[PDB]
C-alpha cells in the first residue's frame, strides 16, 4: 500500500517518468494497473517478488534445478577461482559468473536462420544466443529455421560480461574474423 502510494505520487508529479516498483504480493499489482498512467509499453514495471519466487520454484518442478540457473543468471558476478575450493565448486562458480546481456547482431548475421546464427555464436564468438527481438515489436525464444536474422536484430545472450557480448556486434564475417583467440575480435575497417 505504501509503495502504491509512492507510485501514485511520482506519476501525479509527471506522467512520463518510467517507474519500476517492487511489490510483495501479486494481489496488489492490480491496483497499479489502474493508476491512470501506468503504461507497460512505456517501461513501467512491477517486479513482484511473489510471482517471481513462486514462479521460479514452479519451473524447478518441471526441470529440477532451474531456479538456481536463472537466479544466478540475473545477478552480476565476476568469476573468482581460489585454492581451498573443490572441483565441483569451481565448475559451479564459473557458471555463476555468467549473466544475461543483450546486444545488436552485426551485419555479418544478416539473413542467417536463427539456428545457424546461434551455432555461429557458440562456435566462433564463444557466446550463447537464446532469443531475438523480431520487428510491430515481439520477443522470440529459440525460433526455428523459419525465422531469419534481419538487419539490426537485437539478440539476448549468456556471457561472462558486457565486454564479452560486444564481439557479436564487431564480428565482420570472413572480411576479418578468422583467428581463434576470440580476444582478437575488435571493430573492423569495413
Amino acid at each position: 500500500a505504501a509503495n502504491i502510494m509512492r507510485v501514485i505520487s511520482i506519476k501525479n508529479y509527471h506522467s512520463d517518468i518510467k517507474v519500476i516498483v517492487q511489490l510483495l504480493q501479486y494481489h496488489n499489482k492490480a491496483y497499479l494497473l489502474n493508476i491512470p498512467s501506468w503504461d507497460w509499453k512505456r517501461g513501467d514495471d512491477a517486479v513482484c517478488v511473489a510471482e517471481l519466487k513462486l514462479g521460479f520454484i514452479a519451473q524447478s518442478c518441471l526441470a529440477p534445478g532451474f531456479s538456481t540457473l536463472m537466479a544466478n543468471l540475473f545477478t552480476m558476478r565476476s568469476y573468482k577461482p581460489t585454492p581451498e575450493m573443490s572441483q565441483w565448486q569451481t565448475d559451479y562458480m564459473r557458471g555463476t559468473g555468467m549473466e544475461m546481456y543483450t546486444e545488436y547482431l552485426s551485419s555479418a548475421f544478416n539473413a542467417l536462420t536463427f539456428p545457424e546464427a546461434a551455432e555461429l555464436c557458440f562456435s566462433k564468438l564463444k557466446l550463447l544466443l537464446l532469443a531475438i527481438e523480431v520487428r510491430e515489436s515481439t520477443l522470440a525464444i529459440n525460433p526455428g529455421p523459419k525465422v531469419k536474422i534481419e538487419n539490426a536484430t537485437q539478440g539476448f545472450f549468456i556471457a561472462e560480461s558486457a565486454e564479452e557480448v560486444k564481439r557479436a556486434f564487431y564480428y565482420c564475417k570472413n572480411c576479418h574474423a578468422n583467428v581463434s583467440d576470440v580476444r582478437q575480435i575488435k571493430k573492423c575497417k569495413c
Binding site: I20, A63, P64, T68, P115, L139, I141, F156
Partner: protein, 183 residues
C-alpha cells in the same frame, strides 16, 4: 522410510531468512561468512530465498526486455492481456478456443534431457559439451544452456547446476542437460 526413498526424494524449500540454509543439509561445511548463492543447497537447487531476486530492479532499468524474457519463461506465458483480464475482477475466463489463438500452444519450454540413453547418449560417453550443443541445435532444434551434474562420483543423489559450460568441457553419461525446446 518407504519400503514395500528418504533423502532421495526431490525437495525445494522456500527459506524466509537466507542464513537458515545451513540447516537444510549435512556434509556441506556450513559457514555464515558465505553468501546464499555459494551454499551447497542453493548450488543443488533445493533451496530458494527471495533475496536472490533483489538484483531484478537493476536488470529492469538496464534491460527491460531481459525481464520480459524471464517473465515469459517462468510464468509459462502470462502476457499483459492476461493481467488486464485478471484486473477486471472476474477471475480467469475461458473456454474452448479458436484454433487461431490455440496457435500459441506452441512455445519454448525449459526442459531436461538425460544423456544416459537416447540419440544424444553418444556425446555422453566422453564427448565434450560443445559437440552436443552443435549436434542438438542442428538436428533437434534444441539449445543446451547448462548441465545438472552429480556432486559425488567414484555417492549421494545430490546434483549441481553448471550454467553454459566451456566448449571443451567433458561430459559424463550420468549428466542431465537443461534445454530450450519447441516440442
Amino acid at each position: 522410510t518407504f519400503d514395500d526413498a528418504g533423502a532421495n526424494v526431490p525437495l525445494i524449500t522456500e527459506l524466509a531468512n537466507d542464513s537458515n540454509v545451513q540447516f537444510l543439509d549435512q556434509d556441506d561445511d556450513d559457514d555464515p561468512d558465505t553468501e546464499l548463492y555459494m551454499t551447497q543447497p542453493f548450488a543443488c537447487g533445493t533451496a530458494f530465498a527471495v533475496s536472490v531476486l533483489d538484483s531484478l530492479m537493476s536488470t529492469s532499468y538496464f534491460n527491460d526486455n531481459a525481464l520480459t524474457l524471464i517473465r515469459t519463461l517462468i510464468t509459462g506465458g502470462a502476457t499483459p492481456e492476461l493481467e488486464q483480464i485478471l484486473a477486471e475482477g472476474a477471475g480467469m475466463r475461458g473456454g474452448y478456443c479458436s484454433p487461431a489463438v490455440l496457435a500459441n500452444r506452441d512455445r519454448c519450454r525449459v526442459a531436461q534431457i538425460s544423456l544416459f540413453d537416447g540419440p544424444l547418449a553418444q556425446f555422453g560417453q566422453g564427448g565434450h559439451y560443445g559437440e552436443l550443443f552443435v549436434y542438438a541445435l542442428r538436428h533437434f532444434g534444441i539449445l543446451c544452456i547448462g548441465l545438472y551434474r552429480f556432486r559425488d562420483t567414484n555417492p549421494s543423489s545430490k546434483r549441481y547446476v553448471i550454467t553454459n559450460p566451456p566448449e571443451d568441457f567433458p561430459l559424463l553419461p550420468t549428466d542431465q542437460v537443461y534445454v530450450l525446446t519447441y516440442k
